[PDB]
Symmetry: none
């Protein structure tokens, strides 16, 4: 028990309320694409996964299918590929320990062109091998490099528990880059069929970093309840910042809220001359937050007033 | 011509003088290891490169061999591998245009385990496959993902000349992460044979992010002369910051000097309980700066008074 | 009733426990000085006060004599003067209403050299006129100006009740400067005999603002029980912060605890090259807390477990 | 020479431009009152000052008469008294050394009812004795205590030169409170003849503190050129903040502009239900900035383009 990490249910609901007023967020109408869930089921049936892993995936696939709502104007290939990678990332985020050390050999086996040590990781390598179905060469490289960071970040996150963040540093943002997986989702905001890199990458690339900040930090704000209030996670971004600035988690929550609103403003500026790019950005962000609110099985936000 | 980007020899010389005094930099005594240059020449002989590539590589090898001085306490495996990857990185930094679009296929061919479209990129892929000789699995992952960024950053850097950077963003730091290659050199500061990741990674990882800031920004300060005063490069970190904050390049240089100083302080705070880790950092930074000064064929700092 | 201002006995005791080991507070041995009690008794006898006021002053003098323990290594003149002004400040804090509007005339009659409208305020003017017995000119000016603030802050404090601090401002800290009387006690930490101003004022002045924050806030922390849990005061600093930030009084208590710890660290850094000055601060803070705990007749902290 | 304090003329003009557009500053129409200057001249004739001091005063009186414009709605008693105290404060700000140690004895002689050691300080004592012509009792106390702070802050400011503010953080604001004289001007924004304290003090007092920040910080921003770029003052607020946080004066100026905008918003929120009180604040701030711009003999801002 440390008061530093304690945020009351009323305090958190207030933070969320303030957040949504600041960015003028309104809950979109429910998004439905009836092809997504059957296609994801077919994907799972096709993997050379144990029956136990497939049974687990059913619980995680119900959450992954809503990721298609993040890209409502994108092609099916974009939306379905993002849902597939979301299923994979969710499985590893929750169950990385069940794969033993297979996750630690992933990067070397990948660049050696070796079979992976776990069939789940073969599925992930194959996803990496085929991102050219919806992204250009810059984005494919970024999806690969971000995946390697996420796998290692997931494996080492908890090494910093038991209070092993040092008190004076910039480590929380570094680690959050590694855990967040943001560039993979950010690049699909600007798909290569609609926005071929050769013509558009120069226009949208300057907005990529503030977009990634929004992706990482908005999840930190919206999942603080399931991670730290309701849960036992004390090595997420918010708690890492609290431990390295001395501040309460409540203040770091409010600081993160303000940083997101600042990033939202700057993306509006950057993409103001190009309303097609900016319209994909706006659709992503509203659905991203709405997915966090509606996926109560993962984030439990129906236990909060905001 | 524009006044914002011009920096007199006298102004640049003074910035370097106050930078060196502020971080208490002294030129280390020269480092000599008689095995490095023959080993690198043997490496170049063994690559199935064209005779023209081997002739250029002989030139860059004379600049590359000095990187062994950055890790004087480390094994030969650390020092030589860092020299090899430095040779390859200088080749690509200088000559990326001569490989055509082979660099843009590098990441997908890498993870598909296929031959590269240029033998130079095969040599790069083989280096990524073998970092386990001196690094642990986290460090190997980070060398791979950094190399993927460096190739793509070098390929797209100049898309942003001709006044492509919009005037309001986080983009310069984003792009310098990609172009800088910092994590590969930072991870060698803490080699796996001396500092097995299982025991030491949790102790030095909080220091990695400010170290990369130091590596990237210190090159930005010390290579500004050859890039922008002596040369025509206006898409580097300094000029990108100037174009997105409204400041002169002189001001952006001074701010970057201040940032490096702040990072130097915070790494000293982080690593004070671990003097072996701090010693490796101190060896690196003195030699890192000294190499920039001494390699006049690349940075021309003997034309500056400081 | 409103939940926003409710703090339970176990909640408050836990906050106090959290405060004390955060600053490494250990209760000092009882401080005894045989000459303080009789000297204060003679001062009360000599004042041309009514018998009713002298009877009141005898009650408050039992609480006031403990202030000499705040300056254990100071001259008798420092300890006794601090005790006398403490007696006067307690009389006004408790009984300002019994003087009618005499206190509102205090400052203009003072600077006009005129008789005050109540003998009690003549004694207060007389104290302000003799601070050169233990302070230099800067300290004497700060005791005068702080007394003027304290009289007026006490007079207008309760104008802000029944809810009329508007809910978005920095007014709480402003009003607390007025009501707290902190600079008078802070300047006696550095008395002019031991630390003459011409040499020492430039050394200890940078620590005065964080000292005043510690003095003010620490009373806010430790007197919250008698004021708001045990009593009816809802216009103190903690309640004012709660009413202008929308936070619970409980949260505002914790924020103020974190603030005091931050000031303690700041003063330890500032006065590190002057450990004699720091020693006087450490003696002050320990006895200041101890006096709050021991003076149960004013703060009732023997009704709390911590 | 120290780059820490160096701001170029282009950089400073851009800060002022950003500052003015951020608070929507427009230069008010010139304010003229034919009675102000003759009355101030008469006041100066009546003073028992040496002919030298009276001659010196002519230079400062021409600057002081502009202060009536800060209170365009207020009575003559407000505008004229503010001009008089401005004359005395400007004389002491520039010429405090010419009075020897008379300023150090000011506060004790004042509260002892003694004649002051210099005729100039008798005039200052008399002003403090007669503020009831336009202020109520809280305002009168605040003008007295602010005057004592200003006299002492001017006397000891330069003791912190030769680089002796240490590197911790609350000291610059502490010293600026002392030197700024802000409360005396802020109280006249809500004068007792227009806004009798009995009815309005509870309404405007919550805006006093952000007002005082605006008065102190706006001078710091608009007088940085005469003090530090053109001048030799390195103990003002901006330089003191730069020495305690490590930042450049350029960064500290931007931070201060941001704080002023924040205070302006907060005051608009506080006084929104009372547009008459808000109107007096808007008139004050516009004419306060305008007087800085127009008083070129003191601030030299006609040498800056903004
Ligand atoms: Mg995770
Ligand atoms: Mg997670
Ligand atoms: Mg999360
Ligand atoms: Mg280069
Ligand atoms: Mg490069
Ligand atoms: Mg460079
Ligand atoms: Mg009180
Ligand atoms: Mg009280
Ligand atoms: Mg109290
Ligand atoms: Mg001044
Ligand atoms: Mg001045
Ligand atoms: Mg000034």
């Amino acid at each position: 028990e440390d008061v530093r990490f304690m945020v009351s249910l009323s305090e958190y609901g207030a933070i969320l309320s303030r957040f949504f007023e600041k960015i003028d967020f309104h809950l979109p109408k429910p998004y439905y694409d009836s092809s997504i869930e059957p296609a994801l089921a077919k994907y799972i049936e096709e993997q050379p996964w144990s029956e136990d892993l497939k049974t687990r995936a059913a619980k995680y696939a119900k959450q992954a299918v809503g990721i298609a709502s993040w890209y409502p104007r994108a092609s099916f290939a974009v939306r379905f590929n993002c849902v597939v990678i979301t299923l994979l990332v969710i499985i590893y985020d929750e169950d990385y320990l069940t794969f033993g050390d297979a996750g630690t050999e992933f990067s070397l086996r990948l660049v050696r062109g070796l079979p992976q040590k776990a069939p789940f990781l073969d599925s992930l390598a194959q996803f990496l091998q085929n991102t050219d179905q919806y992204l250009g060469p810059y984005g494919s490289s970024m999806v690969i490099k971000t995946t390697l960071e996420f796998v290692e970040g997931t494996n080492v996150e908890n090494d910093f528990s038991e209070a092993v963040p040092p008190d004076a540093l910039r480590f929380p943002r570094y680690l959050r880059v590694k855990t967040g997986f943001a560039e993979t989702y950010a690049h699909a905001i600007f798909p290569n069929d609609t926005f071929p890199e050769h013509k558009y990458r120069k226009l949208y690339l300057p907005a990529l970093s503030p977009l990634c900040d929004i992706i990482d930090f908005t999840n930190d704000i919206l999942s603080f309840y399931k991670e730290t209030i309701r849960g036992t996670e004390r090595i997420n971004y918010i708690c890492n910042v609290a431990n390295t600035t001395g501040s309460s988690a409540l203040r770091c929550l409010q600081e993160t809220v303000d940083a997101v609103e600042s990033r939202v403003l700057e993306i509006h500026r950057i993409l103001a001359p190009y309303p097609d790019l900016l319209a994909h950005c706006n659709d992503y962000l509203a659905a991203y937050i709405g997915w966090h609110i509606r996926t109560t099985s993962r984030y439990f936000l129906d236990e909060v007033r905001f």
